[PDB]
Symmetry: none
Subunit: 72 residues, 12 copies
Amino acid sequence: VVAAAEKTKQGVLYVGSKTKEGVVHGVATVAEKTKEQVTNVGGAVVTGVTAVAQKTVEGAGSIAAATGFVKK
Amino acid sequence: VVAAAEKTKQGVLYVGSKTKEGVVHGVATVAEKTKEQVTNVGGAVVTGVTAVAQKTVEGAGSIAAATGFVKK
Amino acid sequence: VVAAAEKTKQGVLYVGSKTKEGVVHGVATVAEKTKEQVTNVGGAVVTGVTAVAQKTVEGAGSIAAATGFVKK
Amino acid sequence: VVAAAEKTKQGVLYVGSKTKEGVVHGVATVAEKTKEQVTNVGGAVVTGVTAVAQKTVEGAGSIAAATGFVKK
Amino acid sequence: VVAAAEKTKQGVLYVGSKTKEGVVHGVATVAEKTKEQVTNVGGAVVTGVTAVAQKTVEGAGSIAAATGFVKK
Amino acid sequence: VVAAAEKTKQGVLYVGSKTKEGVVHGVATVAEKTKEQVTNVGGAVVTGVTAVAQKTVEGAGSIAAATGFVKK
Amino acid sequence: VVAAAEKTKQGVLYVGSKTKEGVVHGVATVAEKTKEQVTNVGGAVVTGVTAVAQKTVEGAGSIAAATGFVKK
Amino acid sequence: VVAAAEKTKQGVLYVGSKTKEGVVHGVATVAEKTKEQVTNVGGAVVTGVTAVAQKTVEGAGSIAAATGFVKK
Amino acid sequence: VVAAAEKTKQGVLYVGSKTKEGVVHGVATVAEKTKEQVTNVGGAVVTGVTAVAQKTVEGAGSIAAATGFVKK
Amino acid sequence: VVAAAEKTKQGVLYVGSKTKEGVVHGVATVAEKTKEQVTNVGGAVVTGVTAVAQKTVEGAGSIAAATGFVKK
Amino acid sequence: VVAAAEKTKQGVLYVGSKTKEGVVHGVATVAEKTKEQVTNVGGAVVTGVTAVAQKTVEGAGSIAAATGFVKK
Amino acid sequence: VVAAAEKTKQGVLYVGSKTKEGVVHGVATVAEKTKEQVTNVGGAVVTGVTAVAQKTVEGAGSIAAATGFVKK
């Protein structure tokens, strides 16, 4: 799980939103009458109404992520 | 799970949205009358109403992600 | 889980939002009449109404994250 | 879980929001009539109404995070 | 869990918000009629209405965090 | 859990907020009719209405934090 | 112009309404550059969304209306 | 112009209303550059969203209305 | 102009209202550059959202209305 | 102009209201550059949100109204 | 102009109101550059949010109203 | 102009009000650059938020009103 970013160096931007009812659900585990519940989150959960990513990682960057689940 | 990005160097942008009812569900595990529930999230879950990615990774970048599930 | 970012060096930006009802849920574990509940979060959970990331990691940066789950 | 950031060196920005009802929930573990509940958070949970990250990690930076869960 | 940041060196910014009802919940463990409850938080939980991070880690910085959970 | 930051050296900023009802909850453990409750917090919990971080860690800085939980 | 009613003497009623975003306009004389305009409403104008009239005239009832438009 | 009612003598009523964002306008003379405009309402104008009239005239009742528009 | 009512002698009522953001306007003469404008309301104008009239005339009742518009 | 009522002699009432952000306007003569404007209200104007009239005329009742607009 | 009522002789009432942020305006002559403007209200104007009138005329009652607008 | 009432002879009332931030305006002649403006209110103007009138006329009652606008 190796991430390497390298950089050797020798306008009008717009996002517009006009909502009127903005019910947003992300990673949801909805249940009734269970016994066991495990929610393992290790990535990148971005929730919103205007989830706007503008000019991200313009240079160098690494988001190296790793999860796991062992059951025995 | 190796990600490598390298860069050696020697206008009007618009997104517009006008909603009136914005019910959004992402990764959902809806259930009734169960016993076991496992939700392993390790990637990149982006939920929204205006999920706008503009001019991303313009240089170098790596989002090297790894998950797993072992049951025994 | 190694993340390396390196950089050797030798306009109008806009986000606009006008909501009127902004009910947002992120990583949710909703349940009724259970026995066990485990919520292991180790990544990056960003929730909001205007979740705006502008000009992030313009230079170098690393968000190397690792989680785990062992059951025996 | 090693994160390394290095940098060797030799405009109008706007976010606007106008809400009228801003109910936001982040990482939530809602339950009724259980026995055990564990919430292990070790990443980065950013909740808000205007969760705005502007010009972050412009130089070098590392957010190397690690979690775990052992049950026996 | 090593984080290293190094830097060797040889405009108008705006965030505006106008809410009218700002109910925000962060990391929440809401329950009824249980026996055990453990909440282990060791990362970075940032809650607010205007959670604004502007020009953070402009030089060098490290937020190396580690958590754990052992049950036997 | 080592964090190292090093730096060897050889505009208008604005955040504005106008709320009218600002109910904010951070890390909350709300329960009824339990037996045991443990809340171990060792990271960085920042709660507010205008939680504004401006020009933080402009030079060098390290927020190396570590938690734990042992049950036997 | 004359109305008379003589009376000599010698049951669940349910209206359930569950409307949403109802807009009601009555006698509206919207106009521009209005040289001559006349509205002479002189009768019953029921202008509901759910207009219910149950058991209106159970006994002796009389309604008389004389609405003249004299013009020379 | 004359109305008379002589009376000589010798049950659940339910209106449930659950509206939302209701807008009600009555007799409205909206105008611009208005040289001559006349509104002469002289009768019953019920302008509800849920307009209910239950058991209006149980005994002796009389309604008389004379609404003239004389013009030369 | 004359109204008379002689009376000689010899039950759950429920109105439940649960509205939200109701806007009510009556007789409104909105105007601009108004040379001549006349409103001559002389009758009953019920302008509710939930307009209920239960058991209005149980005994002897009389209503007389004479609303003239004389103009030369 | 004359009204008479002679009377010779020889039950749960419930109105529940749970409104929110109600705006009520009556007889409003909003105007600008107003050369001539006249409003001559002379009758009953009920302008509620929840306008309830239960058991209004149980005995002898009389209402007379004479509202003239004489103009030369 | 004359009103008479002779009477010769020989029950839970509940109004529950739970409003919030109610704004009430009566007879309002809002104006600017007002050359001539006249309001001649001479009748009953009920301008509530929850306008309730229970058992208004139980015995002998009489209401007379003469509201003239004489103009030359 | 004359009103008479002769009477010869030979129960829980509940109004619960729980308002919040109520704003009440009566007869308001707001104006600017006011050349001529006249308000001639001569009748009953109830301008409450919760306007309740229970058992108003139980015995003999008489109301007479003569409100003239003479102008030359």
